[PDB]
Design an enzyme around this catalytic site. Structure first.
Site, PDB file in Angstrom:
ATOM      1  N   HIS A 259       0.817  -1.212   0.000  1.00 47.72           N
ATOM      2  CA  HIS A 259       0.000   0.000   0.000  1.00 47.72           C
ATOM      3  C   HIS A 259       0.868   1.287   0.000  1.00 47.72           C
ATOM      4  CE1 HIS A 259       0.094  -0.197   4.491  1.00 47.72           C
ATOM      5  NE2 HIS A 259       0.266   1.113   4.333  1.00 47.72           N
TER       6      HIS A 259
ATOM      7  N   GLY B 163       2.173   5.978   9.736  1.00 49.39           N
ATOM      8  CA  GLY B 163       3.599   5.856   9.478  1.00 49.39           C
ATOM      9  C   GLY B 163       4.223   4.608  10.088  1.00 49.39           C
TER      10      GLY B 163
ATOM     11  N   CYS C  80       3.324   1.521   9.548  1.00 48.83           N
ATOM     12  CA  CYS C  80       3.279   0.429   8.575  1.00 48.83           C
ATOM     13  C   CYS C  80       4.686   0.019   8.145  1.00 48.83           C
ATOM     14  CB  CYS C  80       2.415   0.793   7.370  1.00 48.83           C
ATOM     15  SG  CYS C  80       0.765   1.386   7.794  1.00 48.83           S
TER      16      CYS C  80
HETATM   17  C1  LIG Z   1      -7.212   4.237   4.590  1.00 52.97           C
HETATM   18  O1  LIG Z   1      -7.027   2.839   4.341  1.00 52.97           O
HETATM   19  C2  LIG Z   1      -5.892   2.234   4.815  1.00 52.97           C
HETATM   20  C3  LIG Z   1      -5.719   0.940   4.350  1.00 52.97           C
HETATM   21  C4  LIG Z   1      -4.526   0.302   4.624  1.00 52.97           C
HETATM   22 CL1  LIG Z   1      -4.239  -1.280   3.960  1.00 52.97          CL
HETATM   23  C5  LIG Z   1      -3.535   0.901   5.367  1.00 52.97           C
HETATM   24  C6  LIG Z   1      -3.727   2.187   5.856  1.00 52.97           C
HETATM   25  C7  LIG Z   1      -2.672   2.833   6.715  1.00 52.97           C
HETATM   26  C8  LIG Z   1      -2.949   2.469   8.157  1.00 52.97           C
HETATM   27  O2  LIG Z   1      -3.896   1.752   8.475  1.00 52.97           O
HETATM   28  N1  LIG Z   1      -2.099   3.028   9.039  1.00 52.97           N
HETATM   29  C9  LIG Z   1      -2.156   2.822  10.428  1.00 52.97           C
HETATM   30  C10 LIG Z   1      -1.725   1.621  10.990  1.00 52.97           C
HETATM   31  N2  LIG Z   1      -1.807   1.361  12.299  1.00 52.97           N
HETATM   32  C11 LIG Z   1      -2.311   2.319  13.091  1.00 52.97           C
HETATM   33  C12 LIG Z   1      -2.760   3.537  12.623  1.00 52.97           C
HETATM   34  C13 LIG Z   1      -2.705   3.812  11.261  1.00 52.97           C
HETATM   35  C14 LIG Z   1      -3.294   5.085  10.709  1.00 52.97           C
HETATM   36  C15 LIG Z   1      -4.914   2.856   5.578  1.00 52.97           C
END
Ligand SMILES: COc1cc(Cl)cc(CC(=O)Nc2cnccc2C)c1
Ligand SMILES: COc1cc(Cl)cc(CC(=O)Nc2cnccc2C)c1
Lengths: 304, 304
Positions: free
Chosen positions: A41, A143, A145
């Site tokens: 992603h 961030g 990820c």
């Molecule tokens: C908007 O759709 C998304 C889909 C995917 Cl596969 C990934 C993301 C990024 C995400 O989740 N980051 C994140 C990971 N852990 C805690 C908090 C955050 C904000 C967003």
């Protein structure tokens, strides 16, 4: 004495953390040999996440579009490919800090250390468990990820998890290092609900043995039970059914304490039916299920 | 989202861990520049611990009696001295892996990461707090002595703790890196009881803000209180009295959530008087006091 949610030393994993940027998206990468692994992603923009066609999106990207930075030095990308939900960026330099490593897909109920990172830099380390519903209850922000979960066997780091997303329910989903998600989750901004989470019974029992080893024995009673009778109580409290394999895996802890597995099950049965009555076990007012029998043995014997 | 007892990445501290042996005693040493720091009880035998005369015991030791091994290479000892309860072994080689470091004597209520070690090798890392009674609730076995506690400010490791002993009560006592014990403890095999431990109120409040930030708001009520009224309730439950400095230190968390410090105190007052009624806050059934307001801000903002 003492019992803590202990993580593995993160040194060998910090030396692998890099920063991967693609367009306006920046996340963490795992650099091992001449390959950087990161969630696919990274190629998406916020506009693309509703239903991304990763094959199409990747086709509009070339080696030069993937900016990989290790500390402050730029890595040259000579190849790129998509393996399931991860991108493998081939670089011209082997990571001089690559430890002895394996990629393992862990079983639910098993535990691992997470090295949370932001911009290729580590912020912290904590112990996690892969829940029976294949989610993890971690601590991750935007961030984070590309941050990885792992275990260590003396000098070998076994990478088991790569962090990809947080669900609207506040829980964390991710993949193994081949890009296969744990659970039914997809890397898409859509409604995704995790299944019913159960309590890892073998881990709760392992933690009761750690409590006995560390002086907390108040919950030990004059009773016993059978696997079948205990499991009736486990089903009602949404605990994982206890098998003979779980009893066998508890063998080392049972031998150390001299308390039979079924006698410990009876203490657990009474704790489930009657609660803690205001008391604590190992400084906790609830039954802890994120310590495997291996974690208990390791911590109580001092394996380095 | 998510909140975990997160430790600092231990990489910079692992590169400093060495093994110190004196006669038949082996423990951990901390190698920084050309000096190895270790607990002075390394010079004792089990027979000496009842009432050791460390000055006399050290006099029967020469540089060659201190075997220092970093990984598998032997360090040459060119000097030795006792600073309070630590020995400083001067070696002829500066540690090539010495990070930017400071020696800090932490305040009670403050937190730190422990890198538990056995035979100069790290086994695990966990977050600890220096209790108001100056003990730590760690996880340590025989051979863990010399393991260190620390904090990290981007590239600077601040060493705050060196592990020395476990009390008969199962609690852990140790020194700063100048060899001064935290608390009234002495490095002697004698009856030593820790004082009454209190709950670190500012930390419990900081953790309530983390719970609010991470979605757990059930405990928020329609009430408020004053510092004086809250402290009457804090005294009864053996909580540290809350000062205006603590209120000020909670300012960043109060601004982020929009919940006044005294309103959060009122939620805490009701939690103390009525319990959790079977509910949990951040996956815990008790009030957590080992997260400082700085730890909460750090984890909730992603400081690397
Ligand atoms: C908007 O759709 C998304 C889909 C995917 Cl596969 C990934 C993301 C990024 C995400 O989740 N980051 C994140 C990971 N852990 C805690 C908090 C955050 C904000 C967003
Ligand atoms: C016998 O008198 C002693 C006095 C001192 Cl100053 C030190 C020791 C060694 C010790 O406590 N080690 C240890 C530290 N944490 C957990 C467990 C252990 C066994 C022993």
């Amino acid at each position: 004495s003492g019992f803590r949610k202990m993580a593995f030393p993160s040194g060998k994993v910090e030396g692998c953390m890099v920063q991967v940027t693609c367009g306006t998206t920046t996340l963490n990468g795992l650099w091992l040999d001449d390959v950087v692994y990161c969630p696919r992603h990274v190629i998406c923009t916020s506009e693309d996440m509703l239903n991304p066609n990763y094959e199409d999106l990747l086709i509009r990207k070339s080696n030069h579009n993937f900016l990989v930075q290790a500390g402050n030095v730029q890595l040259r990308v000579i190849g790129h490919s998509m393996q399931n939900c991860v991108l493998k960026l081939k670089v011209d330099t082997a990571n001089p800090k690559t430890p002895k490593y394996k990629f393992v897909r862990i079983q639910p109920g098993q535990t691992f250390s997470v090295l949370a990172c932001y911009n290729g830099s580590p912020s912290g380390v904590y112990q996690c468990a892969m829940r029976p519903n294949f989610t993890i209850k971690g601590s991750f922000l935007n961030g984070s990820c590309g941050s990885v979960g792992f275990n260590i066997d003396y000098d070998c780091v076994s990478f088991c998890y790569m962090h990809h997303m947080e669900l609207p329910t506040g829980v964390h989903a991710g993949t193994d290092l081949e890009g296969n998600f744990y659970g039914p989750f997809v890397d898409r901004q859509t409604a995704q609900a995790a299944g019913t989470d159960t309590t890892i019974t073998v881990n709760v029992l392992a933690w009761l043995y750690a409590a006995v080893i560390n002086g907390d024995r108040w919950f030990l009673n004059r009773f016993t039970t059978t696997l079948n009778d205990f499991n009736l109580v486990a089903m009602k409290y949404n605990y994982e059914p206890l098998t003979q394999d779980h009893v066998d895996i508890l063998g080392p802890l049972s031998a150390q304490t001299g308390i039979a597995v079924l006698d410990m099950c009876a203490s657990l049965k009474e704790l489930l039916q009657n609660g803690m009555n205001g008391r604590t076990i190992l400084g906790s007012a609830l039954l802890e299920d994120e310590f495997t029998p291996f974690d208990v043995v390791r911590q109580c014997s001092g394996v380095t």
